[model samples]
Target chain A: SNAQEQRMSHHYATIEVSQQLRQLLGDQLVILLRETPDGQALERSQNDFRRVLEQGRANTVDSAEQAALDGVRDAYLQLQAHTPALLEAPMADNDGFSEAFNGLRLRLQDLQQLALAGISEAET
Target chain B: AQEQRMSHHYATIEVSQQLRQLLGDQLVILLRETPDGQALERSQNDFRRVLEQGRANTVDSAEQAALDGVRDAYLQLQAHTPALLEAPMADNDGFSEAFNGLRLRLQDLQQLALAGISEA
Candidate 1:
């Protein structure tokens, strides 16, 4: 029974973690939209997001879950790659920033959907 | 003019973030093996209050209309949440779908709220 509970915990945790990531990303985007965006705040938010992602990965033992997190990581990397350009001139680089941000959110949704599917599949 | 627009953008983010956090908490409650109906109800109420407050801060018809969309979606989601919470976890696909759909709708609003910020 304990094992079963733990298994379910891992699955549910994905939804929770991805929600957290998406919220954090939302905050970061808000910060970036500021007239004088705070570098420190952006760095802190980015660090917080990465730490949560790593912790989520550490909690998983299943291949599918792990693969889903890997997808998150890749999407995050894409966002990270585009962050500097946005920071330099958010108004000028809005298109790139929007694309990268949406890409990351999409991946996070995928992670959430995967967990929902896993839980639903478990019952049937 | 630019300054006023930026202020509106900031206000929009504040309102959106507050409601989004409450929504996330509601989902977290559902994530439990046995969803806590009481906690979820409180969270949903909290969301309502924030949404109400957000209305006062709306600077234009665009912001008002966006918030209206959120309210419409949230009401739909809230209406179904009772039955969802009552259902067994194994048969809660409807709940998950509703949650996901609301989340997507919120994301769109957040982007719309932030749209002018990047053009400045």
Candidate 2:
């Protein structure tokens, strides 16, 4: 409401954006990342994601919620061997890079359309 | 401050080492062949001295001289590059642009080498 509040609003807005993004992403577990007040939801949500990411330091990409978080773990791993032609192709020029960007954009649009095909704005 | 200086040294060393490897002893010969290339030795030495000084304290006795030496070396090398890299060499590399990325790395190093002490 004042200069003091405006300076703090960015921090609050960051949290709000994250909560809305989580809701839009439609992950049931991410429901824990929302609160109408107190303002620590973003921090808690970040902690949760870190657990998912580091579950492998204990090792799994997209590790389920139940994965043990014991901090002393070995090196983690990720898949690297299976890129399709679109990913593998070397760029010949600006045209090549532009085409690759467009291809990626189309894939994003297609996935979003497929996921949200039957949903209304009110569904969330 | 120590960490910052060491990191710069490490980065410069990387560029220096890679360029030397790519060009071999011929690297020295290549530089000595030209006034600009020959002049790089002073900068290289100053950078080495700066790097050595970094191993101890942030304050360097010849810090200003070293910074200017490194800066001047890069300027000379940069100016010479357009002439040396007249055409793409061997799969579009081996030119000044490809001189172990030396052209750009030297410029970047020049800035870091000078500004680092000033930051003190």
Candidate 3:
């Protein structure tokens, strides 16, 4: 139970960080954040964090999806601040700047889509 | 057949010239192919002339100026006589007639260029 509480607390702490990052970076961060880490890793980390926070409460009180959404939203924010700099960095002619730029754009699109889906699900 | 091709070619040239004048040199070209192969070939030849001139001068300031003159005249005529081109030939009013005459002259110049290219 203590371990669960600690995990949940950690999750809340990360979620808070994510929120602050989102606030700092704005919507652009969402696209950027999606690329740095895999969705599964993000999900696991958030779930562990949530479980810890929900340990003392009844199982019905916990909401894993919401916690995960908050975590992603925050990371997305962080990426917004980071992506432009990454793009602007000088690259050799052989370097695949076009591919990388396009990839980043696609990743951002995915993150935005996921976040919107989360909000939509919450609404229903 | 040669004359018709020339007329269409000139029309295409005028469209390009007018577009550049109105939109500026920095504007991108986006042309659609004509469904008819012969028309497409004629249009392409005329289009090529504009593109060649664009490349030759890099910035064809003189051609641009000429384009502006044509545009200004058209605009002024439109302002003086609304619906000048759309008015019936039977109406034959003075302002409308003058505007129509000017439009025909412009169209002829455009057609001449097309004919020249087709023949060339």
- Interface RMSD, candidates in the order listed: 21.4, 24.1, 31.0
TM-scores, one per candidate: 0.41, 0.19, 0.18
Q: How high is the lDDT of residue A21 in model 1?
A: 72
Q: What is the lDDT of residue B51 in candidate 1?
A: 77
Taking the tens digit of each residue's C-alpha lDDT, what string does model 1 give over A23-82? 776667656644456788999999998998899778756456666666667667666765
RMSD of 1: 20.5
Instruction: Give one digit per residue, the lDDT tens place, for model 2 in A1-124.
Output: 3754443333323322222322222221122111121124434543554454343323221122112122111111111111111123321222322233233223322322222221211121
Docking class of 3: incorrect
TM-score of chain A of each: 0.68, 0.22, 0.27
Model 3 chain B lDDT-worst window of ten: B25-34
Each candidate's DockQ: 0.02, 0.01, 0.01
Better candidate by lDDT, 1 or 2: 1
Off by over 4 Å in 3: A1-124, B1-12, B16-58, B83-119
Say which candidate scores most in lDDT. Answer: 1
| Native contacts recovered by model 3 | 0.00
Q: Tell me which of candidates 1 and 3 scores higher on lDDT.
A: 1
Looking at chain B only, the TM-scores across the models are 0.71, 0.29, 0.29
| Model 2 lDDT, residue A115, Cα | 21
